[PDB]
């Protein structure tokens, strides 16, 4: 029941996701591990499990700043995959390089959380990242509530990838010049998601699924703002961000974002 243009739009997004989402984290290598002012303290509860290909397990039970290098490496690895995702998309590729930088700076965290939700096991409170597992030791925390609520919707791969496109093509991110072009693209991804749900879901039980997804995207944008401000405060008193994170989080747009500009021309 989708139009031919809507099916091609989904095909292109699914192609891009398959090529750029390392779901088994088998290429996440050479990362740092935890070794063997007042607001930044409040700004900072999981165990890390590293399964060896031989059976052996290394587990890290936490006691603050000792997890930051590892998190910076995982985030940077995820952000590289999200930049590669946006590059594969023709609608993104045809935008001016400055608007490409602006959209990625605005959506990097949101797209990373959407991809992390696909590996989140809500029954065990664990993000299953291939041989790495981040297990909640223990709904009040907005980011946790978001992962539990999104997982509960039991979305298809197509719905997650349309959520990524809707979040990526946000016309109101700081620095966006082609507001009307990006707004038209976002509207067509949202209409495509709405049509996909009408055509593929048994009508009554999924009657408001599209609205629930759009509400989750609104909540995600709000959490993104809280995360960015928390990160800048931590970075200000204890530097940890990698050069790519510094560019994405704001720590002549092509001159200020040379790593991003290089990654986009590759
Ligand atoms: C609040 C917060 N506390 C902590 C704490 C530890 C941590 C990591 C290793 C050992 C001990 C503690 N990790 N960790 C993370 C964290 C970070 C990541 F990169 C990441 C993952 C998570 C859990 C899971 C998938 C792999 O990637 C977060 C936040 O994660 C969410 C937004 C909630 C997802 C965040 O992004 O700050």
Swiss-Prot record:
Hyperforin binds at residues 75, 113-116, 227. One of its GO terms (cellular component) is intermediate filament cytoskeleton. Keywords: Activator, DNA-binding, Metal-binding, Nucleus, Receptor, Transcription, Transcription regulation, Zinc, Zinc-finger. It comes from the Eukaryota. Signal peptide: none annotated. It is found in: Nucleus. One of its GO terms (molecular function) is sequence-specific double-stranded DNA binding. Disulfide bonds: none annotated. Expressed in liver, colon and small intestine. Belongs to the nuclear hormone receptor family. NR1 subfamily. Nuclear receptor that binds and is activated by variety of endogenous and xenobiotic compounds. Transcription factor that activates the transcription of multiple genes involved in the metabolism and secretion of potentially harmful xenobiotics, drugs and endogenous compounds. Activated by the antibiotic rifampicin and various plant metabolites, such as hyperforin, guggulipid, colupulone, and isoflavones. Response to specific ligands is species-specific. Activated by naturally occurring steroids, such as pregnenolone and progesterone. Heterodimer with RXR. Interacts with NCOA1. Interacts (via domain NR LBD) with CRY1 and CRY2 in a ligand-dependent manner. This is Nuclear receptor subfamily 1 group I member 2. It comes from Homo sapiens. The chain holds residues 142 to 431 of 434 of the full protein.
């Amino acid at each position: 029941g989708l139009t031919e243009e809507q099916r091609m739009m989904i095909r292109e997004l699914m192609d891009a996701q398959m090529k750029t989402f390392d779901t088994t984290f088998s290429h996440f290598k050479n990362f740092r591990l935890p070794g063997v002012w007042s607001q930044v303290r409040k700004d900072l509860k999981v165990s890390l499990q590293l399964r060896g290909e031989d059976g052996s397990v290394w587990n890290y039970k936490p006691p603050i700043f000792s997890l930051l290098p590892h998190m910076a490496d995982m985030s940077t690895y995820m952000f590289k995959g999200i930049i590669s995702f946006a590059k594969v998309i023709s609608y993104f590729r045809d935008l001016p390089i400055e608007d490409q930088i602006s959209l990625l700076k605005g959506a990097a965290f949101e797209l990373c959380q959407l991809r992390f939700n696909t590996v989140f096991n809500a029954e065990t409170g664990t993000w299953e990242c291939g041989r790495l597992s981040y297990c909640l030791e223990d709904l009040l925390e907005p980011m946790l509530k978001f992962h539990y609520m999104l997982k509960k919707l039991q979305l298809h791969e197509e719905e997650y990838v349309l959520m990524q496109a809707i979040s990526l093509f946000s016309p109101d991110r700081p620095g966006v010049l082609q507001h009307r072009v990006v707004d038209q693209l976002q509207e067509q991804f949202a209409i495509t998601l709405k049509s996909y749900i009408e055509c593929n879901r048994p009508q009554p039980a999924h009657r408001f699924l599209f609205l629930k997804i759009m509400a989750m995207l609104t909540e995600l944008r709000s959490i993104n703002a809280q995360h960015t401000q928390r990160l800048l405060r931590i970075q200000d008193i204890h530097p940890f961000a990698t050069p790519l994170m510094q560019e994405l989080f704001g720590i002549s747009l092509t001159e200020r974002h040379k790593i991003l500009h290089r990654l986009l021309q590759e």
